[PDB]
């Protein structure tokens, strides 16, 4: 895949790392998302990142977004993924005041299945479990994107401008050993940010470092009781545990009653998504 | 203000923390940075125009010229175009092999430029290796200085007063935001010390951290500092003392740029 064979149709969104454009593939005539991450790195690092991103070809699962290729055009690494009509879930928070609990359970099931597929088949941790990094489709599909396939890409990203928010587990910020439990902590934070209609680090603005200190040395946030089921509060509390050892691992999360019950429940997520985003 | 009809926008170069760079041809080669601000409030725009004035007066061999602004092609600034690449590109992207005296000369020129900028009470925030360009080969040019009214977003008539820019060069005191006005001379001194570390190491600091968030937290809390064992063995010892001096956590203990300039003048 080359730069000259895409015609940018629209902008999907822009983040601190880069900007994603809804584009067309001239040779094949299909619409795909093209993520441009601007970074100034060595050509050897560019080739290393491209080869490491090639691995994304065999990452096939209903809970991870598609991948067609990646290449470096001019001062930017460009990754080509399959287009998700619903965009990301942060777009949904901008649409709806708060995500309902049943679809939130569906989201949780999708993300844990994606995480366990990634861990079991690729030995890869997401490290970026955010509302912006899980994507939704018109048919009801929920997939994971922007996970840590290329380590050198993460190292190049490390040199980044300051952010506004953070979804990091305290063990990563402290610098201690981190495992998938960091991803579970991040996804628990994401569940809190979806259930309530706000970014939940400063419980009901505050700068980035103050956010980070607060999530390092003070108790983790919790959902507002009385407007949510006890099961989903138990699920997020087990996800949002400061100690990685006490925090539940994936194997407990599959057999977590929240996940099993939400899988038993039949929720028409496609219709609700179409209603809330038009 | 500069009338946009005379300026012509050539191929894009890139984007940054608060603007996007185009190549312009207004009375010669220039660089036009369209700002990310979509609806600049009149107060912000007026304070920015006062900046346009102050920065247009500034004239050093070591800082890029600041011609002016234009409100027609959205909100934009016209600055001197630098054919020479950025210092970040030479040190990391191109891995340019600089001799000892060349690195000392880059440090001296940067210190001189920041000294002049500080003498007119201009706090060159967003100070990093990206903003330094090696014109004609070795002459150091500081750009993207000042512009505090634009780099930061505005909550109407109130500036957001929150950090903005790359975190590897940011001061712990401006990372913490413990004060409404933490940008000062010493913050620029710390940022210059970080660029000094990059000059004396050839690598970005905190290479053992892969996530920027961990960097921010452990810098502001003091758990992480640029270790001085990465510096070159051929680096003079007083140069090492100078850089360790510039990167100290305590704001007030960091020296002011005349002292640093005296330090390199002793080194050379
Ligand atoms: N395949 C896709 N389909 C639809 N929208 C997408 C797709 N990929 C990305 N996007 C959108 O593009 C936006 C830009 O994403 P990024 O550039 O990764 O920034 P981000 O996701 O907000 O995370 P950071 O930390 O800010 S870089 C996302 O927030 C999505 O809304
Ligand atoms: N006057 C200039 N002459 C030549 N290239 C420039 C000039 N100003 C900016 N650039 C280039 O434009 C690109 C983006 O620069 P900026 O938008 O200023 O971002 P930055 O300098 O990396 O950091 P900040 O915080 O945004 S100023 C880089 O590749 C710079 O080398
Ligand atoms: O895109 C990234 N982050 O963006 C939001 C903040 O992480 C991202 C971050 C780290 C990373 C390591 N190797 C690839 N990485 C990314 N790219 C990426 C990879 C796979 C897919 I599928 C889609 C993608 F966009
Ligand atoms: Mg993303
Ligand atoms: Mg610059």
Author numbering:
A (entry chain B): 63 to 266, 307 to 380
B (entry chain A): 343 to 610
Question: How did the manuscript describe this experimental structure?
Answer:
CRAF (RAF1) is one of three RAF-family kinases that initiate MAP kinase signaling in response to activated RAS and is essential for oncogenic signaling from mutant KRAS. Like BRAF, CRAF is regulated by 14-3-3 engagement and by intramolecular autoinhibitory interactions of its N-terminal regulatory region. These structures reveal a fully autoinhibited conformation analogous to that observed for BRAF and two “open monomer” states in which the inhibitory interactions of the CRD and 14-3-3 dimer are released or rearranged, but the kinase domain remains inactive.
In the other there is no-defined orientation with respect to the 14-3-3, allowing reconstruction of the “isolated” CRAF/MEK1 kinase domain module. We refer to this configuration as the “kinase domain open monomer” complex. Datasets used for the CRAFSSDD kinase domain open monomer and CRAFSSDD open monomer were recorded from the same grid, the latter at a 30° tilt to mitigate the effects of a preferred orientation of these particles. We also had the subjective impression that the kinase domain open monomer particles were more heterogeneous in the CRAFSSDD dataset; these particles resolved into multiple classes in early stages of processing in the CRAFSSDD dataset as compared with a single class in the CRAFSSYY dataset. Activity assays of freshly collected size-exclusion fractions revealed increased catalytic activity in fractions containing the monomeric CRAFSSDD complex, suggesting that the Y340D/Y341D mutation in the CRAF NtA motif can at least partially activate CRAF in its monomeric state.
